[PDB]
Amino acid sequence: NPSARIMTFYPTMEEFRNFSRYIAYIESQGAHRAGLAKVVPPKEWKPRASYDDIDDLVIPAPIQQLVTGQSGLFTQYNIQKKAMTVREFRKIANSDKYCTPRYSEFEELERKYWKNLTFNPPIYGADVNGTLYEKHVDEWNIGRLRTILDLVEKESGITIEGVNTPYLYFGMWKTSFAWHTEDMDLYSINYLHFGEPKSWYSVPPEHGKRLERLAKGFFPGSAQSCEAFLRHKMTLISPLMLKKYGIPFDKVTQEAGEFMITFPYGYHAGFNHGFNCAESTNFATRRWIEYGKQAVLCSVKISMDVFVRKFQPERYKLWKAGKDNTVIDHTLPTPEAAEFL
Ligand SMILES: NC(=O)c1ccnc(-c2csc(N)n2)c1
Ligand SMILES: [Zn+2]
Ligand SMILES: [Zn+2]
Structure with missing residues (x-):
């Protein structure tokens, strides 16, 4: 992958059963050069029967995302709001004030995002400690991936919420994640359980120092x-x-x-x-x-x-x-x- 382009993988049920093996395989294909890869799971695989029973799930610390800036360069501030349920959050998300605008292509929605991110700050139901995987799901279970990271909990006893435990992220239109690498420059896995899409931007790791030099010069x-x-x-x-x-x-x-x-x-x-x-x-x-x-x-x-x-x-x-x-x-x-x- 000399271009360092984001690649997409379609593993079969057998290929999907060994997590750490499939990551090694995607690296053997050059996936890691882009710094981000998409994995489309087997059609037969499902982590939960339905999602109709999570309305009463509590988002303890929702954040109003206040963005300040101009000319494609911004700073995001998080205001902690009072705890709300998934029902309360979904109602705000689909309301006339906060719902997704009308769009034909992604490019249109991307233009709408960068044109309006400083206005009408949305609420992000981020860093909720929990999983939506059912107990029996063995394949790609975010709560129990069985990688070498397990050495931190097995040998030290130390728990790092979100790092070696799962986190749930309830999003709405215009909610975002700022430019970053993972804690300790670790890998990460992100499964979109349900709802509207999530668009991503990535800088190949080999050009990561350039983004930093850019960021430093601006701030x-x-x-x-x-x-x-x-x-x-x-x-x-x-x-x-x-x-x-x-x-x-x-x-x-x-x-x-x-x-x-x-x-x-x-x-x-x-x-x-x-x-x-x-x-x-x-x-x-x-x-x-x-x-x-x-x-x-x-x-x-x-x-x-x-x-x-x-x-x-x-x-x-x-x-x-x-x-x-x-x-x-x-x-x-x-x-x-x-x-x-
Ligand atoms: N909001 C998201 O869906 C999302 C996507 C990618 N990374 C993070 C994240 C937040 S803090 C960290 N180390 N990664 C969050
Ligand atoms: Zn991340
Ligand atoms: Zn600091």
Whole structure:
């Protein structure tokens, strides 16, 4: 994938059963170069019988998303509102004030989003601790992915809500996620349970330092105050701004019943088309360890010691001494992808 374009995968039921194996396979295809990949699950697979019984589910901390800015460069502020139910949230989402506008092509809706994001602030029902998967679902269960991340909970006992536990995201028209990479530059999985689509923007990991240099130059105040200020997740930058400053990027629309995989150091942002529900968590592969070791944090921290000892014992002394000069190649697939190479 020399173009570093977002790829789409269609695994069969047998191919879908082994999660960590299918991620290794997609890396063997170059999926990781874009920093974002779509996975369309088998038609026979379903994580829940119906979604008609979640009206009474409580969103404890909804946020009114206040956006300030101009010329494709914005700052998002979150105002915590009183706790509301899925019924109360859906009612606001489909109301005349907050409902999705009329559109023919995605391009029209994208223009409507970037033209009106500063007006009529929407409410995001984000960071809800929970899952919508039924107990018996073994295939791609966000709550129990069984990757090497499990070492943090198995060996330390430490729980990081959203990172090694699932999070539910109730979106409406114009709700968004600002430019960011994952905590500790981890991978992420996003399943759109139901509702209107979710559009995504991505910067290939190999061009990730360019977005940072751009972001730094625009917000010199925020950059002097924090080493990794984009981790605050308040910075919105339009595709036109990225096109203007020569930042390579791609776009994709996630429809209900689809998965999105974000890769280590893959910068992403996007917005919700209307009333929807997405389930999210972080995971890892042997390849991620170098990123975790090199990750520039906000001045969430996972101890890398357990990983370095178990998977890089030869490098353990060198890394503790600070003499580990390893330079990351973003084009390289995870060692687990050796069987497909
Ligand atoms: N709102 C979303 O659907 C969404 C999509 C992608 N990433 C995140 C996210 C938030 S905080 C983090 N590390 N990732 C949230
Ligand atoms: Zn994310
Ligand atoms: Zn900071």
